[PDB]
């Protein structure tokens, strides 16, 4: 079983990278890499 970590309220980030460009013709940009950690339950 895996607990959901979609909502940003209780995600568990291990890494991150958030680039934000913006020029002004209001060109924009937003890159975002994220590495998560997840709960786990295993029964046999």
Partner 1 sequence: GVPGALSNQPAPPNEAPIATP
Distance from chain centroid for Cα 5: 9
Q: How far is the CB of 41 from a second copy (least distance, A)?
A: 9
Q: Is 23 in the site for partner 1 (CB under 8 A)?
A: yes
> In the numeric block, which tokens belong to residue 23?
């020029």
Q: How far is the CB of 27 from partner 1 (least distance, A)?
A: 4
For 28, the enclosing helix (H) or strand (E) is strand 28-36
Q: Is 42 in the site for partner 1 (CB under 8 A)?
A: no
Give contact residues for a second copy (rule: CB under 8 A).
1-6, 8-39
């Amino acid at each position: 079983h895996y607990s959901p970590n979609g909502d940003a309220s209780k995600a568990t980030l291990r890494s991150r990278q958030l680039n934000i460009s913006e020029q002004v013709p209001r060109s924009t940009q937003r890159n975002e890499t994220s590495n998560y950690e997840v709960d786990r339950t295993i029964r046999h």
